């Protein structure tokens, strides 16, 4: 298939809400071009494909995890074991989806990146999928995933700060997810808040230099920073 075509089928599939197929097409795009870089359009498409495929399983896993422990509290052993094998099956899928994109990041996407925006986008993306592993892993697979997440987010942060404006949506999205990582995985509400509020304040101090469309782009991710901050900080 042509690469206008694989993008095309990726778009087709996004509209059919057939997200694994969207991943497949976009994948063939990501591999086809070498250390020549996806465009913005395609790089967003890929992210969205995988975000929707992982997202469904993350939702399933939370529901099933929440049922698991509640049934543990009641002592329904027969149920719990059923539930566990079922969770296992979901976690097998999570691992496969994460491995998929993590392998593609390490081999193609991250080392192909020449520009700051791309380097930050894909290192953040690498942080994301390690973070998703850490959500459901345990013990020492979990602390291994949390380490990989730290290292990727950090390098992303270092590069964003050197090169990207504090109002840049990619820099803002990086700050957003790094904070969530502190909150949900590391259980550090203060660090989470501090990191989000820093990013939010740096952007605020430039928001009014922006043209209109750029302002609207930034404000989208600033709203998310703001709402999290309001939530973590609420009575």
């Amino acid at each position: 298939m042509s690469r206008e075509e694989n993008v095309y089928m990726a778009k087709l599939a996004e509209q059919a809400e057939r997200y694994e197929e969207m991943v497949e097409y976009m994948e063939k795009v990501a591999k086809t071009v070498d250390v020549e870089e996806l465009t913005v359009e395609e790089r967003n498409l890929l992210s969205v494909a995988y975000k929707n495929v992982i997202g469904a399983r993350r939702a399933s896993w939370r529901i099933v995890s929440s049922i698991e422990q509640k049934e543990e509290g009641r002592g329904n052993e027969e149920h719990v074991t059923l539930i566990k094998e079922y969770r296992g099956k979901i976690e097998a899928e999570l691992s496969k989806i994460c491995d998929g994109i993590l392998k593609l990041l390490d081999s193609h996407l991250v080392p192909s990146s020449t520009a700051a925006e791309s380097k930050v986008f894909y290192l953040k993306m690498k942080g994301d999928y390690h973070r998703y592993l850490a959500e459901f892993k345990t013990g020492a697979e979990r602390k291994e995933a949390a380490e990989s997440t730290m290292v990727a987010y950090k390098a992303a942060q270092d590069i964003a700060l050197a090169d990207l404006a504090p109002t840049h949506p990619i820099r803002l999205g990086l700050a957003l997810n790094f904070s969530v990582f502190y909150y949900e995985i590391l259980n550090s509400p203060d660090k989470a808040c501090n990191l989000a509020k820093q990013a939010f304040d740096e952007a605020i101090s430039e928001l009014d230099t922006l043209g209109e469309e750029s302002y609207k782009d930034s404000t989208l991710i600033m709203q998310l920073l703001r709402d999290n901050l309001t939530l973590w900080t609420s009575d």
Binding site: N177, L220, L224, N228
Partner: peptide, 7 residues
């Protein structure tokens, strides 16, 4: 509704 980036 703890929330992440749309990308």
């Amino acid at each position: 509704r703890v929330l992440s980036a749309p990308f």
